[PDB]
Design a protein around this ligand. Structure first.
Ligand code: I20
Ligand code: NAG
Ligand code: NAG
Ligand code: NAG
Ligand code: ZN
Length: 696
């Protein structure tokens, strides 16, 4: 009664090879599930993290290379364009011969980089303001500095777009880095050295005189600025509540509650907003509604910005763009990045050009590349089986509502309503294969030259920003996919109340029609549950069936949610991570992801039970002394076989809202009674704590 098939052999062999059966499952299931992988694999020099998940992404890149690298004669223009973009990107010889000239010729159009110019104040005396300089970077080049203005969906009216104001991202991965001591010292040193190196290269290329003292003085001043900005930003822990984040005022209310004076100004919000919107010939009233996500940050900005010179501000502002551009220039410029990215990521070498290039084209043409990818790589009747799994787990979520004692009846029935309304999106949009016109038209105004990679990427930034901005008065497109298909990941949108499973994730170990269903449910089953449960985590629970930010909870249930979930904040908050130097996880910042994991795996397990019930026990896998309950958990865990560079562990513990793979497994399975059954775990077994968290 062993399954003997081709596909069973492959599955079994992968499971066997990953696991370490000399470890007690009940002491450390991660080591049990993954210890074999961990012995045999080192992290590649180009990887900051590595494991079964990242291997799928490497393998997807190979597919993208195959489909992009050879011109075909039947290729529609949209595909011609992805291929030409790929070609421009992989031509290092062309790129190296251009030096930094493409940057140099760009710099004027963003009001310069003063450290890298002569007499900067006099050049731009006539023209420069903070309003204009921020707005050009934002609107033509999509770089958000000092103040992030962006058109997005209205949280409280999901069918419309509003202007948003928010705090900007920083040059370093999180606000914590700007302590610049201990585990953060090298990053800060490398960061500022990086600035200096690039300022030097630009000067040398312009044939200007180099004063190392002045360079250090101006870039250290840049760092002090950003340090202050970093300290002014709101913590993530204070940004978790979408109701608190949503403060809609008019540009007038903003002008008068959030004044800034820059270089002796003061700052005209009306003017700022219009310098951006005019890019696309739209005109804005002082009476325009704006959703301000970062009130206290704007308030805290006031005393900081006054202190600094125009020269300081623009030194930071241009640096933040130039940062992103150097690796698209010649080798010498690429090289200047090295210590910075090692410090942040642990990597000692650049990822292969063809991989970076394939990823870049995919990022900018995800429908064209998605089309090519699915033609190569993706079945057909996968779509329908997954459709079935999603039916099943949606129904399990609903069903579970009755067992759940921390909600009252109106709230439970509201949760049901939201559950039923969730719109699923599987594999890829038919559109991109069966409608050539529509796919050509998406990229109509794009025109790439194969010798002009840098102009190509600049074109993409301009086009991207212009499209986004002109959405202000347009309605949100219900049908539009929020991911390309060539993506190893899955998604929930609170705004669309939508779950999304790109073709890229619908493969082993998550899914195959030919692998055991224990594996499918423990794999993709648990992913579906994770995405659905995002609809009901500490963010998503705040949005209703239509994607609108609206309270549908009673005070009691709202309070009980918080109380139930506080258990997981404490639990994961209590994990210490060696790779990050013994630091504890942020149990608050990972909560939503942790809630989704625990809910998700529960739901998937119960759906598999409902399946075994109706259909029967399935045949065992050869070479494995486990039953299918046990394999279910085995596979769920092996999704996350892998490990981290210490430099990236320090990064991720602050910037990833997901727990690290190992703690995802331990966390969730500590909360699973079913797991402890399956592996016969003693009470107070490390893997079977007596006290367990439960939300969903
Ligand atoms: C591999 C890893 N992915 C993940 O764990 C899961 C997939 C997974 C699950 C289980 C095992 C392995 C992989 C994806 P995921 O849901 O985490 C996704 C990146 N996240 C989202 O879809 C966002 C959530 C939610 N929609 C949300 O935050 N929203 C929606 C509207 C605005 C807003 C905000 N703020 C990863 O991406 O690192
Ligand atoms: C790279 O670009 C240069 C442009 O100077 C061109 O001469 C060469 O043929 C290109 N190489 C490839 C492989 O496209
Ligand atoms: C914004 O103000 C500047 C200040 O000089 C002015 O020159 C410019 O025309 C204004 N732009 C808009 C969009 O009103
Ligand atoms: C660890 O758990 C205890 C007990 O709930 C809690 O008081 C403590 O704050 C937790 N540690 C963290 C950082 O979450
Ligand atoms: Zn998630």
């Amino acid at each position: 009664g062993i399954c003997k098939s081709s596909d069973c052999i492959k599955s079994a062999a992968r499971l066997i090879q990953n696991m370490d059966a000399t470890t007690e499952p009940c002491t450390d299931f991660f080591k049990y599930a993954c210890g074999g992988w961990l012995k045999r694999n080192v992290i590649p020099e180009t990887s900051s993290r590595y494991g079964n998940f990242d291997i799928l992404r490497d393998e997807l890149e190979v597919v993208l290379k195959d489909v992009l690298q050879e011109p075909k004669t039947e290729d529609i223009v949209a595909v011609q364009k992805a291929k030409a973009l790929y070609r421009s990107c992989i031509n290092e010889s062309a790129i190296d011969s251009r030096g930094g000239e493409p940057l140099l010729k760009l710099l004027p159009d963003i009001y310069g980089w003063p450290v890298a110019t002569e007499n900067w104040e006099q050049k731009y005396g006539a023209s420069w303001t903070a309003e204009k300089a921020i707005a050009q970077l934002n609107s033509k080049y999509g770089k958000k500095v000092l103040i992030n203005l962006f058109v997005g969906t209205d949280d409280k009216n999901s069918v419309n777009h509003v202007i948003h104001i928010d705090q900007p991202r920083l040059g370093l991965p999180s606000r914590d880095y700007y302590e610049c001591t201990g585990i953060y010292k090298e990053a800060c040193t490398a960061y500022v050295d990086f600035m200096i190196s690039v300022a030097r290269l630009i000067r040398q290329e312009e044939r200007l005189p180099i004063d190392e003292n002045q360079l250090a003085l101006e870039m250290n001043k840049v760092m002090e600025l950003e340090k202050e900005i970093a300290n002014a930003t709101a913590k993530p822990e204070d940004r978790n509540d979408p109701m608190l984040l949503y403060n809609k005022m008019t540009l007038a209310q903003i002008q008068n509650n959030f004044s800034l004076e820059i270089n002796g100004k003061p700052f005209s919000w009306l003017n700022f907003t219009n310098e951006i919107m005019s890019t696309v010939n739209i005109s804005i009233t002082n009476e325009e509604d704006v959703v301000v996500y970062a009130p206290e940050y704007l308030t805290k900005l006031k005393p900081i910005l006054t202190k600094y010179s125009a020269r300081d501000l623009q030194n930071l502002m241009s640096w933040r763009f130039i940062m992103d551009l150097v690796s698209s220039l010649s080798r010498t410029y690429k090289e200047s990045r090295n210590a910075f990215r090692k410090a942040l990521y642990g990597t000692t070498s650049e990822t292969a050009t063809w991989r970076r290039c394939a990823n870049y084209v995919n990022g900018n043409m995800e429908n064209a590349v998605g089309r090519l990818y699915v033609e190569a790589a993706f079945a057909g009747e996968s779509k329908h089986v997954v459709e079935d799994l999603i039916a099943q787990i949606r129904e399990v979520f609903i069903q579970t509502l009755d067992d759940l004692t921390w909600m009252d009846a109106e709230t439970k029935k509201r949760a049901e309503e939201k559950a039923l309304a969730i719109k699923e999106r599987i594999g890829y949009p038919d559109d991109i294969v069966s409608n050539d016109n529509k796919l050509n038209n998406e990229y109509l105004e794009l025109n790439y030259k194969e010798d002009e990679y840098f102009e190509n990427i600049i074109q993409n930034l301009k086009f991207s920003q212009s499209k986004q901005l002109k959405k202000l008065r347009e309605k949100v497109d219900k049908d539009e996919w929020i991911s390309g298909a060539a993506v190893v990941n899955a998604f929930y949108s609170s705004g669309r109340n939508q779950i999304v499973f790109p073709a890229g994730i619908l493969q082993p170990p998550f899914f195959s029609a030919q692998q055991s269903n224990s594996l499918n449910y423990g794999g993709i089953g648990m992913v579906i549950g994770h995405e659905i449960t995002h609809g009901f985590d500490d963010n998503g629970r705040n949005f209703n069936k239509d994607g609108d930010l609206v309270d549908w909870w009673t005070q009691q249930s709202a309070s009980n949610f918080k109380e139930q979930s506080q258990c997981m904040v404490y639990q994961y908050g209590n994990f210490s991570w060696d790779l990050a130097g013994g630091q504890h996880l942020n149990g608050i910042n990972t909560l939503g992801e942790n809630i989704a994991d625990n809910g998700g795996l529960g739901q998937a397990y119960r759906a598999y039970q409902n399946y075994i019930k109706k259909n029967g026990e399935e045949k065992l896998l050869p070479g494995l002394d486990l039953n299918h309950k046990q394999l279910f958990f085995l596979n769920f865990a092996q999704v996350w076989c892998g490990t981290y560079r210490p430099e990236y562990a320090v990064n991720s513990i602050k910037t990833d809202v997901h727990s690290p793979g190992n703690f995802r497994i331990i966390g969730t399975l500590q909360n699973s009674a079913e797991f402890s059954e399956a592996f016969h775990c003693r009470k107070n077994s490390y893997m079977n704590p007596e006290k367990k968290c439960r939300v969903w």
